[PDB]
Coordinates of C-alpha atoms in Angstrom, one line a residue:
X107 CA 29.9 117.7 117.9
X108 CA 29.5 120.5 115.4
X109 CA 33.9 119.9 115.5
X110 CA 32.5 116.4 113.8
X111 CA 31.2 117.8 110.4
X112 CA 35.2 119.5 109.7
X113 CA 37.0 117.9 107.2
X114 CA 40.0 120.5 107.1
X115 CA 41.3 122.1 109.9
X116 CA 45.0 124.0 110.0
X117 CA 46.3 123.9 112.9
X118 CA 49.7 124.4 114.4
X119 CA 51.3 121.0 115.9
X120 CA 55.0 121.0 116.3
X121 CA 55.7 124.4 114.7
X122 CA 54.1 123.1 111.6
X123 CA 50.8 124.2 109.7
X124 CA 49.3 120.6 109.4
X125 CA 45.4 119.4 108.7
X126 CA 44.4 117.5 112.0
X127 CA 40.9 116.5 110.6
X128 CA 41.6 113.2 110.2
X129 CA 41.4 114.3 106.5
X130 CA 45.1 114.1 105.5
X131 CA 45.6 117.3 103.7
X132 CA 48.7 117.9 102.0
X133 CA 49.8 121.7 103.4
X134 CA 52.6 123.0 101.7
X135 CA 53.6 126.4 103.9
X136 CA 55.8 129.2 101.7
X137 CA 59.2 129.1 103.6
X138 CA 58.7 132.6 104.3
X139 CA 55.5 132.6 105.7
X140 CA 55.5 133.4 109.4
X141 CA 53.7 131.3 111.6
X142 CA 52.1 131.3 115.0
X143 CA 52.9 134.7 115.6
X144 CA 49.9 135.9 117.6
X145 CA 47.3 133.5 117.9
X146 CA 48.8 129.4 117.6
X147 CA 47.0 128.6 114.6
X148 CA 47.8 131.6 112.0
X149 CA 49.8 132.3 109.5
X150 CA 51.0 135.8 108.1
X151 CA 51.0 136.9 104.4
X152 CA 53.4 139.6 104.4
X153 CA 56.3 139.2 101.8
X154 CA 55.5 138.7 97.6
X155 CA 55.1 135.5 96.6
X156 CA 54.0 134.2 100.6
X157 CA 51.6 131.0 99.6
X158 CA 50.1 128.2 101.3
X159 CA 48.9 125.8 99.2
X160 CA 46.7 122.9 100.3
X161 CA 46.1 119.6 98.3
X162 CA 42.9 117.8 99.4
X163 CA 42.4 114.3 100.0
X164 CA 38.9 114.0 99.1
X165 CA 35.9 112.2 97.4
X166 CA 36.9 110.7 93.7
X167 CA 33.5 109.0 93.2
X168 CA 31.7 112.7 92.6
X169 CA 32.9 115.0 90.2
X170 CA 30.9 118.0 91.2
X171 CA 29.8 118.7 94.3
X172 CA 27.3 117.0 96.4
X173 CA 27.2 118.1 100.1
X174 CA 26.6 121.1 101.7
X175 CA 29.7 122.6 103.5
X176 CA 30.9 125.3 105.2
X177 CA 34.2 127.6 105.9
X178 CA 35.3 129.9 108.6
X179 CA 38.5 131.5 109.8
X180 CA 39.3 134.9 111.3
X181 CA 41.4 137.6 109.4
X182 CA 43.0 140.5 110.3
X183 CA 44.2 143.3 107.1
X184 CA 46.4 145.6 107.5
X185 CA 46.1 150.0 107.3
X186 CA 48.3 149.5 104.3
X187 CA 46.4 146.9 102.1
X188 CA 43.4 147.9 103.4
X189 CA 43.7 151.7 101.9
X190 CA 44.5 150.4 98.3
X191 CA 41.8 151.2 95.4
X192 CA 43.4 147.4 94.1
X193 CA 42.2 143.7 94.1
X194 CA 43.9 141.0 95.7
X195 CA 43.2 137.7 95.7
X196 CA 43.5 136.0 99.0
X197 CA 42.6 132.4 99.2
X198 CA 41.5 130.3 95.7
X199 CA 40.3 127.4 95.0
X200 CA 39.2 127.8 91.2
X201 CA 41.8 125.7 89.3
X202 CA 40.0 125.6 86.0
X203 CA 37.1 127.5 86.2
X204 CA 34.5 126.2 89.1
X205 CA 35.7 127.0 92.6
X206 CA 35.5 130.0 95.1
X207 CA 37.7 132.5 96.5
X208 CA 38.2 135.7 99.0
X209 CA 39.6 138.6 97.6
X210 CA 40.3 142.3 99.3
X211 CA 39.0 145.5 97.4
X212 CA 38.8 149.0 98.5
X213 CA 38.8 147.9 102.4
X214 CA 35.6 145.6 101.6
X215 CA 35.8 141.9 101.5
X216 CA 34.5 139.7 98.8
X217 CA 33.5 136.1 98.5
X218 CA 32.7 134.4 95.0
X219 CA 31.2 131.1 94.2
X220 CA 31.7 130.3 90.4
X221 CA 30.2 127.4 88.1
X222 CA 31.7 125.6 85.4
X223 CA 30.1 128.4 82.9
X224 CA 32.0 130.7 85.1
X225 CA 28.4 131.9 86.5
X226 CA 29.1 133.4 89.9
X227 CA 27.5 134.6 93.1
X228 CA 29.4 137.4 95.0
X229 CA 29.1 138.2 98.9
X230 CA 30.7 141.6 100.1
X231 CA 31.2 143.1 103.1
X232 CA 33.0 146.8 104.0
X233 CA 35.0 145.9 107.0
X234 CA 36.8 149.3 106.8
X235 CA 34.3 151.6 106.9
X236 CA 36.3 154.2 105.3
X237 CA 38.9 153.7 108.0
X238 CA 36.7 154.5 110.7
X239 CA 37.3 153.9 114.4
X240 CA 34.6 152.0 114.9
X241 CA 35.5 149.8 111.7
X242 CA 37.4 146.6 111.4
X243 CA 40.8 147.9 109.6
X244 CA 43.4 145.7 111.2
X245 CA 41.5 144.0 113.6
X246 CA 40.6 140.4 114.0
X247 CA 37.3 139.2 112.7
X248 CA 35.5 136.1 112.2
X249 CA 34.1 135.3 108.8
X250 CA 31.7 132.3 108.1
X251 CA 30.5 131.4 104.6
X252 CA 27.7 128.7 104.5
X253 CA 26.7 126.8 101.6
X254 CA 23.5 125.4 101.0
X255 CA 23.7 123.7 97.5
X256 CA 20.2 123.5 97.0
X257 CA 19.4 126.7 98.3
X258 CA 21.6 130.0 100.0
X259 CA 25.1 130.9 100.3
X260 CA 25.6 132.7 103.5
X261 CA 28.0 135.3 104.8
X262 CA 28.2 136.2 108.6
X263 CA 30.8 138.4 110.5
X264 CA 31.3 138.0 113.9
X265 CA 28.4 135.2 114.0
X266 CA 26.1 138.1 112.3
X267 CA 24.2 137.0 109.3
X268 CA 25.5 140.0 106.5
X269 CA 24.6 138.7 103.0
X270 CA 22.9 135.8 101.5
X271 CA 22.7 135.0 97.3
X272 CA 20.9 131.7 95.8
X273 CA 23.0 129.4 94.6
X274 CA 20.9 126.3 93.9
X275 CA 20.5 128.0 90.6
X276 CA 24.2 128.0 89.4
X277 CA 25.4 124.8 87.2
X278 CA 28.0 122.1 88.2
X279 CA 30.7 123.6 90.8
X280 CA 33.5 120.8 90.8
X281 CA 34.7 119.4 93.7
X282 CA 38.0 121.1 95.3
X283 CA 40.7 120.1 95.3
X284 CA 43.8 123.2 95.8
X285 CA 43.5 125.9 97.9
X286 CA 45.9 128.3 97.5
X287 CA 46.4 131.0 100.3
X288 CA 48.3 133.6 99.3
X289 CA 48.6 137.6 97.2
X290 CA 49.8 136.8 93.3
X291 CA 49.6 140.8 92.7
X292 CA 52.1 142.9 93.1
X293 CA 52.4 144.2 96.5
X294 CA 54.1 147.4 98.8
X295 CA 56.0 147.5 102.0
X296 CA 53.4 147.0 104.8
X297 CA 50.8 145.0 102.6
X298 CA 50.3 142.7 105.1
X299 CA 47.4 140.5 106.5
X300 CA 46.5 137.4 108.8
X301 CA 44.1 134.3 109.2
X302 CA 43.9 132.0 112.3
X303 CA 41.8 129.0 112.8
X304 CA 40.7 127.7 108.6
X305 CA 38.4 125.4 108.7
X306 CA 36.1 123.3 106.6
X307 CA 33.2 122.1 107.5
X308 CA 30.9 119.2 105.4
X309 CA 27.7 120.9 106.6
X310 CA 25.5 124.3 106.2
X311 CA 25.8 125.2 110.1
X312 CA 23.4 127.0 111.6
X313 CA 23.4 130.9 112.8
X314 CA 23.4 128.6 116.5
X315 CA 26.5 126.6 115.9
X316 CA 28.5 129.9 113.9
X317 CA 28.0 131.6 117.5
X318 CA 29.3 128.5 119.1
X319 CA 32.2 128.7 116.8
X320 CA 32.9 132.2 117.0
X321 CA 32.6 132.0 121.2
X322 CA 35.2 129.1 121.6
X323 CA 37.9 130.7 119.1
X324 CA 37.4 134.4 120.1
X325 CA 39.3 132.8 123.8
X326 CA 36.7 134.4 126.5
X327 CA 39.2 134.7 129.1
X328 CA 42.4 136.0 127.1
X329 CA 42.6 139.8 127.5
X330 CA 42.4 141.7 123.8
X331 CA 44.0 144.4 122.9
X332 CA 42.6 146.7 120.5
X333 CA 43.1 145.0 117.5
X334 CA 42.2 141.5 119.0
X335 CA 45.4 140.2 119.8
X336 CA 45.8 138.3 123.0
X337 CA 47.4 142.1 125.6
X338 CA 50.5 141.1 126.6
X339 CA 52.4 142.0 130.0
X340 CA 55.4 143.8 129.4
X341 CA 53.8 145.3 125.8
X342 CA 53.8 149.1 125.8
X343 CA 49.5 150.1 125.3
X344 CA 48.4 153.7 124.4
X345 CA 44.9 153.1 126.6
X346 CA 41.9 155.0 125.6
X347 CA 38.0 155.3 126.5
X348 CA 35.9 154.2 124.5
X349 CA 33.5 157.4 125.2
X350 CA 36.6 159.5 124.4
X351 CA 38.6 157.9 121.3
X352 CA 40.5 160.9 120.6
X353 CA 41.9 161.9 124.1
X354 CA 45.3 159.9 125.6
X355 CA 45.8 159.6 129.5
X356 CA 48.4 162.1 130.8
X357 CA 49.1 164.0 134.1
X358 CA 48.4 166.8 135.1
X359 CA 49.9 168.1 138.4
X360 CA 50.1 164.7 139.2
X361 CA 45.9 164.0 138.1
X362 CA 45.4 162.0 135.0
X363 CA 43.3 163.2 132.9
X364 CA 42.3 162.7 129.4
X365 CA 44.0 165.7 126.4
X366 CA 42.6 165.7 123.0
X367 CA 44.7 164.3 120.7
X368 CA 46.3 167.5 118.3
X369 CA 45.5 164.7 115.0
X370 CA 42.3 161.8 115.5
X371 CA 44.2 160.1 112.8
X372 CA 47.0 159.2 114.5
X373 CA 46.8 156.7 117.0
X374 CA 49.8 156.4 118.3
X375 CA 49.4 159.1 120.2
X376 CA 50.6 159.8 124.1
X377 CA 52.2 158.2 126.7
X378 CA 52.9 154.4 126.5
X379 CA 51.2 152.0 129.3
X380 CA 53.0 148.9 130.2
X381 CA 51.3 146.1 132.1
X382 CA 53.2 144.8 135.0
X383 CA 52.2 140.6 136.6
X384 CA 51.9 141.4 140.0
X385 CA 51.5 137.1 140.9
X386 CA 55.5 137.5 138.0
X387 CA 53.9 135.4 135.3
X388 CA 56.8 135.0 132.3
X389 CA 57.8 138.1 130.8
X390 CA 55.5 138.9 127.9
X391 CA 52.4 136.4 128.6
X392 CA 49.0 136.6 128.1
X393 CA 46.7 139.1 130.4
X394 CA 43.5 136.8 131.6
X395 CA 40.9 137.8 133.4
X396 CA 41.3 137.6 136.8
X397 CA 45.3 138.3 136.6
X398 CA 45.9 141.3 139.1
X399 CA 48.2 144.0 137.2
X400 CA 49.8 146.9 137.7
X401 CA 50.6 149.5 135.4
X402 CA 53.3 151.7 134.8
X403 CA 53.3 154.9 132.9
X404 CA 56.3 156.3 130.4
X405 CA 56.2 160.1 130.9
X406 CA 58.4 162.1 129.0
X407 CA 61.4 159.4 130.0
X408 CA 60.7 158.2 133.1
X409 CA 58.3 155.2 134.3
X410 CA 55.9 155.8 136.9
X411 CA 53.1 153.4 138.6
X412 CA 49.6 154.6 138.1
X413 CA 47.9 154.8 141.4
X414 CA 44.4 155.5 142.7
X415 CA 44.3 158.8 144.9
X416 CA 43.5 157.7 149.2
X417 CA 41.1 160.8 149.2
X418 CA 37.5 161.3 146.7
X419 CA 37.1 163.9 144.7
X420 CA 29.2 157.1 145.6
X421 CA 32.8 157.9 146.2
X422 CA 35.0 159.0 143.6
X423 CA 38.7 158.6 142.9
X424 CA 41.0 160.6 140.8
X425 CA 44.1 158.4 139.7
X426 CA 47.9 159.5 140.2
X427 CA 51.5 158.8 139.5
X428 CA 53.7 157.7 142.0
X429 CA 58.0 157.1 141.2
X430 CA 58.4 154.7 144.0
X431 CA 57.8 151.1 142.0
X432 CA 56.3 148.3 144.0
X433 CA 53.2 146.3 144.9
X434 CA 51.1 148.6 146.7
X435 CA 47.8 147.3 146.9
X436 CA 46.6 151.4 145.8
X437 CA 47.9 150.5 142.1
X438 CA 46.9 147.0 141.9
X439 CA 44.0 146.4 139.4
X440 CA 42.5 143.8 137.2
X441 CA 40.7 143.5 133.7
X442 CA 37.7 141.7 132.5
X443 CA 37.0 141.6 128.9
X444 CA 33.4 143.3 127.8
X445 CA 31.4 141.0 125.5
X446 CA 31.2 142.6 122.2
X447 CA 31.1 142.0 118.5
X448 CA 32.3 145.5 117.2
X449 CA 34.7 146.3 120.3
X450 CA 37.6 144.6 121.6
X451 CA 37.9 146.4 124.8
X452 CA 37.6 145.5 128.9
X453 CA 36.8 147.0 132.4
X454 CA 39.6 147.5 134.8
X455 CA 38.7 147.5 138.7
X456 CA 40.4 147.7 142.0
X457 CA 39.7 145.8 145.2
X458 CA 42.1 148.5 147.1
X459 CA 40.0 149.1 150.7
X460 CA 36.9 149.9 148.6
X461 CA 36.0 147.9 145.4
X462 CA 36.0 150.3 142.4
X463 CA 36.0 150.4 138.9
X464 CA 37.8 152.6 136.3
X465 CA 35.3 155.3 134.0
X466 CA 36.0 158.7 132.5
X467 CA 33.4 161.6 132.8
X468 CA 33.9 165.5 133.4
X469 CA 35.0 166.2 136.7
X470 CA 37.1 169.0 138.9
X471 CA 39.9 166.3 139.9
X472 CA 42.3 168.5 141.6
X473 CA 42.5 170.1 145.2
X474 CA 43.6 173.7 144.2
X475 CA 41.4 174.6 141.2
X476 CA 37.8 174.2 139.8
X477 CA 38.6 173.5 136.3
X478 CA 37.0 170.8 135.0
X479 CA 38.5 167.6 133.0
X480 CA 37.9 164.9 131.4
X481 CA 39.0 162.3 134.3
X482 CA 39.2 158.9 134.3
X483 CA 38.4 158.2 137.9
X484 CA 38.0 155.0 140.1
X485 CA 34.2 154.9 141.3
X486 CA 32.3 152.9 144.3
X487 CA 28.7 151.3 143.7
X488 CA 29.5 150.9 139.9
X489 CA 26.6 148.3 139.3
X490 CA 24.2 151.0 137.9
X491 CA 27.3 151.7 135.1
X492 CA 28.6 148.4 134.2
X493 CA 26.9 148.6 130.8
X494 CA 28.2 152.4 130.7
X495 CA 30.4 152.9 127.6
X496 CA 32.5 155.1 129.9
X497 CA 33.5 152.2 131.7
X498 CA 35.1 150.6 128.4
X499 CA 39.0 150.6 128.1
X500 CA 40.8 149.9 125.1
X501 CA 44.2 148.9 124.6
X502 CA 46.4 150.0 121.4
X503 CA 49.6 148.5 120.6
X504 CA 52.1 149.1 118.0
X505 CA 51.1 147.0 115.4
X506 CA 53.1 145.6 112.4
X507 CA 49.7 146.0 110.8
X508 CA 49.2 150.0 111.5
X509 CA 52.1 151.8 110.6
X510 CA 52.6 155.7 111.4

């Protein structure tokens, strides 16, 4: 029912952005602008001059507004237009001089409201974090603005309440009627970014129904991959810990174990992981949870399938190659996605003679020396651990939207 209050929603129906409020929106997609390239209902602004513009079909009666309303969509910027010191423009709807608009600056976000008198009310938020790890730089996330006309304008992230600003004190704010999607300055190779799921809603909702919102789109049972794109079988992954973000898997005389990256910036760093359907799902389809997988490690040239060792090191597991590809229940796994607002990341267990789950901690993994490594091991009697950080695997593809 909180679906009841939109009166603009783009979504993708026969390969076309359309409005299937009920609304009858005009929606005039650039004929370069990609669609439906990662989630179903998103678009990607990528080349110069990429628009979307949307014509409304809405109230004639009121000049200025007279409801409260809200919007929300996710976005996803890439390394490349996040790092520039410049301004863009995203999506407008200021014609004349009322209206609002999202524009990019300096890897923050920034939401205006603007009167008549060209009075405005700004909402920011640094979603890069100066490029941090632990930022959003390329990575799905789900922005809500609410609008209280006699009252507060309202920013969350992720169904978080970030910034608020009084807005019952601005002047007339027309009505809308074009929103234009879409970079007018000049932009570089790379520039790119994403939105999936626009909607408008002719309410204020409430920090209950944003977290309704954000639940249903976020797709519970779709495996993410680091950025928050739907993992992929068949999708090469460099697969990292979340307790160790600068260390890639790799063997060791046949152990895995975790080697600290020679430069933290770069990601792409280590041994590619694809993700084999053991129950032969279509090539390249989404990972849910539940799905048993195997996976197969590239190392230097030749593809192996990552096993768990017969023999423990409150058992404990070291985890192996082995050439000979097949399903052997020893490599068969499966991934459940971890809850989070500021992590896209899962656990990965086995069900192999002893039910285990995947961690990384210092250990002496191998049978012929006492050095120690960091080890990502499979461990029994995990219920003590499974809100343990070490226990959290993420998944990094090669992203149109990080480029090294």
């Amino acid at each position: 029912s909180i679906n009841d209050s939109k009166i603009l929603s783009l979504q993708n129906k026969k390969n076309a952005l359309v409005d299937t409020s009920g609304y009858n929106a005009e929606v005039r997609v650039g004929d370069n602008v990609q669609l439906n390239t990662i989630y179903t209902n998103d678009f990607k602004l990528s080349s110069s001059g990429d628009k979307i513009i949307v014509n409304l079909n809405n109230n004639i009666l009121y000049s200025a507004i007279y409801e409260n309303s809200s919007v929300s969509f996710w976005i996803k910027i890439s390394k490349d237009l996040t790092n520039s010191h410049n301004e863009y423009t995203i999506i407008n709807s200021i014609e004349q001089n009322s209206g609002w608009k999202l524009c990019i600056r300096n890897g923050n976000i920034e939401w205006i409201l603007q009167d008549v008198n060209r009075k405005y009310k700004s909402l920011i938020f640094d979603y890069s974090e100066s490029l941090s790890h632990t930022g959003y730089t390329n990575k799905w996330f789900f922005v809500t603005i609410t609008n209280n006309i006699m009252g507060y304008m309202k920013l969350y992230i992720n169904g978080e309440l970030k910034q608020s600003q009084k807005i019952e004190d601005l002047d007339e704010v027309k009505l809308d009627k074009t929103i234009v999607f879409g970079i007018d300055e000049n932009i570089d190779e790379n520039q790119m970014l994403w939105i999936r799921d626009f909607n408008i809603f002719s309410k204020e909702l409430s920090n209950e129904d944003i977290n309704i919102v954000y639940e249903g789109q976020i797709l519970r049972n779709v495996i993410k991959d680091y950025w928050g794109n739907p993992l992929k079988f068949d999708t090469e992954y460099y697969i990292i810990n979340d307790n160790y973000i600068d260390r890639y898997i790799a063997p060791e005389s046949n152990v895995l174990v975790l080697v600290q990256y020679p430069d933290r910036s770069k990601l792409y760093t280590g041994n590619p992981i694809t993700i084999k359907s053991v129950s032969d799902k279509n090539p390249y389809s989404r990972i849910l949870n539940g799905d048993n997988i195997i996976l197969h490690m590239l190392y230097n040239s030749r593809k192996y399938m990552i096993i768990r060792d017969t023999d423990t090191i409150n058992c404990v597991y070291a985890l192996k190659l082995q050439s000979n590809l097949g399903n052997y229940g020893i490599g068969i796994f499966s991934i459940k996605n971890i809850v989070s607002k500021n992590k896209y990341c899962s656990q990965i267990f086995s069900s192999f003679r002893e039910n285990t789950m995947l961690l990384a901690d210092i250990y002496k993994p191998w049978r012929f020396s006492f050095k120690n490594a960091y080890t990502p091991v499979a461990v029994t009697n995990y219920e003590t651990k499974l809100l343990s950080t070490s226990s959290f695997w993420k998944f990094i593809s090669r992203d149109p939207g990080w480029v090294e």
